[PDB]
Amino acid sequence: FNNSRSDTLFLGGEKISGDDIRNQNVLATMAVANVVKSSLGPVGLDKMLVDDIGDFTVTNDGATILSLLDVQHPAG
Amino acid sequence: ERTTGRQAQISNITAAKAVADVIRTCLGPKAMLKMLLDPMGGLVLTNDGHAILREIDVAHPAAKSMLELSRTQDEEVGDGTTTVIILAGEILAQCAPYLIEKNIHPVIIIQALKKALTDALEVIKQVSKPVDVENDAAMKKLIQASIGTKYVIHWSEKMCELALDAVKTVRKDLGQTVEGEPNFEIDIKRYVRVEKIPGGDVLDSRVLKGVLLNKDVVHPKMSRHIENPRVVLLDCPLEYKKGESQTNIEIEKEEDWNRILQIEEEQVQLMCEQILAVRPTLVITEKGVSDLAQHYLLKGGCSVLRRVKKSDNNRIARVTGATIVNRVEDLKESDVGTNCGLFKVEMIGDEYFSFLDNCKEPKACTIMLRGGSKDILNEIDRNLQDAMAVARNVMLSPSLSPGGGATEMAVSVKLAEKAKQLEGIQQWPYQAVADAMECIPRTLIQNAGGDPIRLLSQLRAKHAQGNFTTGIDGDKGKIVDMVSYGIWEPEVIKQQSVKTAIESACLLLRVDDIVSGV
Amino acid sequence: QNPNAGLFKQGYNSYSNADGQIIKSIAAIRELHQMCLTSMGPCGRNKIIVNHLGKIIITNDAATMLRELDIVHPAVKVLVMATEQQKIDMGDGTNLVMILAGELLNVSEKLISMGLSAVEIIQGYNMARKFTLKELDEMVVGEITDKNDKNELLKMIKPVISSKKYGSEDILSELVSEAVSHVLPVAQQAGEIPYFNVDSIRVVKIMGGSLSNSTVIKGMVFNREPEGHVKSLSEDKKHKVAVFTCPLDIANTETKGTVLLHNAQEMLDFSKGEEKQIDAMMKEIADMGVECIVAGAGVGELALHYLNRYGILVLKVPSKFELRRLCRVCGATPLPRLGAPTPEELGLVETVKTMEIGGDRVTVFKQEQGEISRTSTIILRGATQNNLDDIERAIDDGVAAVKGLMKPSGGKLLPGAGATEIELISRITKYGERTPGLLQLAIKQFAVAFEVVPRTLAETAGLDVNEVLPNLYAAHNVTEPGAVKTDHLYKGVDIDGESDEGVKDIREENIYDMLATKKFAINVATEAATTVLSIDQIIMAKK
CATH class of the missing domain: 3.50.7.10 (GroEL)
Structure with missing residues (x-):
């Protein structure tokens, strides 16, 4: 389950088009949005955000979680 | 990378359970030893609860929160570090089947933990017994709990005198409905700060009322004690000043030296003349003091003490009343040496001291520790901190609670009795709190070797009929009353243990997601 | 390279009890236990059974499932034989034995993990069973006069049609009660000659029409x-x-x-x-x-x-x-x-x-x-031949349920729809803390094992278990200023397809469980749970 191996159009990088990237745009924005879906509202709950050094912090603020959220895909 | 859904709830339970499981056998005087193999090839066989987990590095963030919880818990109470970690870890362990297998929402459990915390603190106050904090014989038998099984057991009577005389100076006992009650606030950290002096005997350890300074007097021959001292505190050092211009002093010709030196001797004399105008017997400068300023104040009949910290001058101002002044020309007439008994240059162990001590208590004392070596001083130090920590818990509330699993089991019985009228979905996570209360007397039995099922069943049935004061003996392991063998811990140990456990339980249940990366 | 130790018999796989083999035996039942959790109740689920002859069978009854399943493991095999104990002596209550005996072993895992000995676990359930059978005699509310009136037979048949055929409960009740009254004589003070054989009611079916056009022949x-x-x-x-x-x-x-x-x-x-x-x-x-x-x-x-x-x-x-x-x-x-x-x-x-x-x-x-007839015929009509055959299986089980109304104490009744199991929770836990010794651990867990019956009916009905269950527990807990306890013995588990603030009462729909069905189900469930707890190990040989 992936999208690769164009096998044509010689280029210095990969190319994904069609319904392939349309599914990747949905899967990327879904995992990013699922982060703050449990923190929405006053009844929402917080979470721990771990850095690369191994430290972490916990906050229920959605603006802080999204600022510390690492999104790999450009769609997210 | 990312852990979401119920998987993070599993990792939060596994992390807190693994940290607790290590020290579950570290509770009690009979606690079993732990072998920790270091990555460098060494090993640590000590059973100390805090010394083990400190050398253990953990990965999961909830495991690090349990380590930081014990660090904050150690600042409140000096002992019972393993008691809080077991209780905080077992509550999440008992709520684990309800959170997953029973599919109970975490907010429902967290809301039930807030009601279980209030009910638990009320039961502790019911089973607790009053104690007289003004009785000297009663306070010594209390502090003795943090004394025995240590090298200070022989001097214990003097160890209590160092702890009691220290808390009595800092304590402020007041109450009313007007300005409020301080609840007997005592700060051991800042005001009670110990000073370790090498040499002498442990019996020679005294509680000094005042401040102590190790810096000596700038002159070898000086007055050893002052009848009526006049203290002068100031910031700006005493030295030849510099102009506001680019002026530089370079002297080549031999007859031009006395021209600048006469100006240097004159300007320093004017700075010392401003001090001597009030005829002080003592001079204390925050910064350094030039040799010329030392001579002018030498013939002026006053002692000079160079280089005193600003934080020291604030404590010097309380034992004296000297007003802090910045510029030497700004010295106020409000600067006085009143309420200062003597100034002592006394040397103990080839080390010059300074004693500003007076006959009154300015809310802060100074502990003078003596011994046979530095290793003995470090032993008395940490043992006095544990002696003052138990003394602090007794002075911050006049109540004692039975130990050895008596209070832990008594609460579990009262929580189960109240749970009968608590009907509704919050009853299920509530009963898990009482089951976690039984874990503390369970580890004491497992460390003892007796049958855990038979004893806990007879121990819980003992509270349901007999008095709540019947606990478990540490040395034996058989059900006994705490009246015969007391083991009376202060309630503050039980207070903070239950409060921080529910807060830690609500902390881990409040995090349903784990995300890594910046 | 790695040698073998512990197996001296022959080449095999040796399973020691120190690995929790008794827990693995319960785990094998948990696979079958979850099968029966979707069966009991009018909201239960039907299972597709493909016979070895290539025949498609869809039915709610679990006794057909266990008959088509070939069992090896003893703890499950005893439950199959225990199901036959409930199937031979009664035509109803087969799901009660499989679910209860499975939950008795589920709550036993907490005692096994605690370290409580299996013999001491068995002793706890045996003492709690005598406490339960003493209560089941006092849980009796009403009793039938054996008048054999049509309306009196509807009170017995109505809860039987439930959990098998739903929505036809009122329609099939008038058809079955009419056929029973034909072959069931009215007599008293005679226990020598048995009456109402299972063969007394014959059921035939034909395509066309519906259940409204069905008739009963004498x-x-x-x-x-x-x-x-x-x-x-x-x-x-x-x-x-x-x-x-x-x-x-x-x-x-x-x-x-x-x-x-x-x-x-x-x-x-x-x-x-x-x-x-x-x-x-x-x-x-x-x-x-x-x-x-x-x-x-x-x-x-x-x-x-x-x-x-x-x-x-x-x-x-x-x-x-x-x-x-x-x-x-x-x-x-x-x-x-x-x-x-x-x-x-x-x-x-x-x-x-x-x-x-x-x-x-x-x-x-x-x-x-x-010249009174000992044999009657029920003529069934329906549009779907497959569903019409399942109605015949529901009526045949209803006939065997009326057989439990005979001499061996079948007139007494207990509140059904999960009402009896909730009251037994408070009564047994009252005996748990009252009886000293280590038995209080197994006795209290024995009452918790009864929580599966109200939860099962709630899970199959789509209702929230976090709502109906705690409201049902508080429903039987009241403070009465007097010796006689009142207010409500009638709170059951709710069957609603159209919601209902709170829960309803048994007195409204008259849906109850029989004493002869409940008392016999407890004896079979405990002996089945005792047999599994009695097995700490297995021994097999080469075929």
């Missing part, structure tokens, strides 16, 4: 047509019937007696021989008052001709299984010979006619208010 219905030219009997009372095992033909010998043909001259004598002998035998049968002859064997051509002149209905029943139950209505006996219809072997029938059922003509056998 006697047995035959599919075969009236071969003779006489379609039906007269309106005269007490028609005599004759059942003959020997076929209808010229008189023969009981041993062999095969007719052989040689020359055409004998065939002319064989024809005239069958003419005079049959006319002589059938005339004497009509002279004795017998207007109907039931032939278990074939009927000759000349036999039909003479019986039609005498006005005797010819009825053939080649099936011997139908003739066995046929003797329970009129009382006739089959005759191996022919020509001697002894009046002691002759029966009595009020009405024999031919009715059109579903478009096909059938000859019935019935009566009106005389």
Whole structure:
């Protein structure tokens, strides 16, 4: 389950088009949005955000979680 | 990378359970030893609860929160570090089947933990017994709990005198409905700060009322004690000043030296003349003091003490009343040496001291520790901190609670009795709190070797009929009353243990997601 | 390289009990336990069972599942035999034994993980069982007077149709209660002769119509047509019937007696021989008052001709299984010979006619208010043949449930729909903390194991377990200023398909469980749970 191996159009990088990237745009924005879906509202709950050094912090603020959220895909 | 859904709830339970499981056998005087193999090839066989987990590095963030919880818990109470970690870890362990297998929402459990915390603190106050904090014989038998099984057991009577005389100076006992009650606030950290002096005997350890300074007097021959001292505190050092211009002093010709030196001797004399105008017997400068300023104040009949910290001058101002002044020309007439008994240059162990001590208590004392070596001083130090920590818990509330699993089991019985009228979905996570209360007397039995099922069943049935004061003996392991063998811990140990456990339980249940990366 | 130790028998896989083999045995039941959790209740689920012969079967009843499943593991095999214990002695409550005995072992894992000995676990349930059976005798609320009235039979049959066929509960109740009252006599103070056999109610079905057009006959219905030219009997009372095992033909010998043909001259004598002998035998049968002859064997051509002149209905029943139950209505006996219809072997029938059922003509056998019949027939009609067959299985289980209403204490009743299990939770935990010793651990967990019944009905109904269950626990917990406890014994588990703030009462719909069903289910569930806890290890050999 992936999208690769164009096998044509010689280029210095990969190319994904069609319904392939349309599914990747949905899967990327879904995992990013699922982060703050449990923190929405006053009844929402917080979470721990771990850095690369191994430290972490916990906050229920959605603006802080999204600022510390690492999104790999450009769609997210 | 990312852990979401119920998987993070599993990792939060596994992390807190693994940290607790290590020290579950570290509770009690009979606690079993732990072998920790270091990555460098060494090993640590000590059973100390805090010394083990400190050398253990953990990965999961909830495991690090349990380590930081014990660090904050150690600042409140000096002992019972393993008691809080077991209780905080077992509550999440008992709520684990309800959170997953029973599919109970975490907010429902967290809301039930807030009601279980209030009910638990009320039961502790019911089973607790009053104690007289003004009785000297009663306070010594209390502090003795943090004394025995240590090298200070022989001097214990003097160890209590160092702890009691220290808390009595800092304590402020007041109450009313007007300005409020301080609840007997005592700060051991800042005001009670110990000073370790090498040499002498442990019996020679005294509680000094005042401040102590190790810096000596700038002159070898000086007055050893002052009848009526006049203290002068100031910031700006005493030295030849510099102009506001680019002026530089370079002297080549031999007859031009006395021209600048006469100006240097004159300007320093004017700075010392401003001090001597009030005829002080003592001079204390925050910064350094030039040799010329030392001579002018030498013939002026006053002692000079160079280089005193600003934080020291604030404590010097309380034992004296000297007003802090910045510029030497700004010295106020409000600067006085009143309420200062003597100034002592006394040397103990080839080390010059300074004693500003007076006959009154300015809310802060100074502990003078003596011994046979530095290793003995470090032993008395940490043992006095544990002696003052138990003394602090007794002075911050006049109540004692039975130990050895008596209070832990008594609460579990009262929580189960109240749970009968608590009907509704919050009853299920509530009963898990009482089951976690039984874990503390369970580890004491497992460390003892007796049958855990038979004893806990007879121990819980003992509270349901007999008095709540019947606990478990540490040395034996058989059900006994705490009246015969007391083991009376202060309630503050039980207070903070239950409060921080529910807060830690609500902390881990409040995090349903784990995300890594910046 | 790695040697082996602990298995001295032969090449095998050795499983030591120190690995929690008793827990793995319960885990194997948990796979089957979850199967029964979707069965019990009117909101339960149906399972598709593909037979080894390539037949599709869809049914709610779990006893059919366990019959089609081939079991090896003992802890599950004992539950299959325990299911047969509930299936043979009663026609209802099979899901109660499988779910309860499975939960008793589930809550035992908390005691096993605690370190409590298996023998001490068994001793706890045995003491709690005697505490339960003492309460089950006091949980009895009402009892039937055995008046056998239709309305009184509806109170028993209504909860039985539930958990099997839903939505037809009120429709099938009027059809079953009418057939029971026909074969169920009204008598008292006689316990010597058993009554209401399972064979007393026959169920037939035909395509077309619906359950509203279904009817109940007071006697047995035959599919075969009236071969003779006489379609039906007269309106005269007490028609005599004759059942003959020997076929209808010229008189023969009981041993062999095969007719052989040689020359055409004998065939002319064989024809005239069958003419005079049959006319002589059938005339004497009509002279004795017998207007109907039931032939278990074939009927000759000349036999039909003479019986039609005498006005005797010819009825053939080649099936011997139908003739066995046929003797329970009129009382006739089959005759191996022919020509001697002894009046002691002759029966009595009020009405024999031919009715059109579903478009096909059938000859019935019935009566009106005389010579009481021990066999009845339920004629079912429906559009879907598959669903109509499942209704037959639900009615047959309802007939065996009425069998529990006989002498062995079947009149007493307990509140159903999860009402009884909740009260037993508070009563047993009251005995748990009261009884000193280590038994309090297993006794209290024994009451917690009853929480599966209300939770199962709530999970199958789609209701929130976090709402109905805690409201149901507070429903039975009240403070009454007096000795007699009141307010509500009637709070059950709710069957709603259209919601309902709170829960309802048992008194509204009169849905209850029988004492003979509940008391027998507890004994079987405990002995099944005791057997599993008694096995700490297994031993097998090479086949």
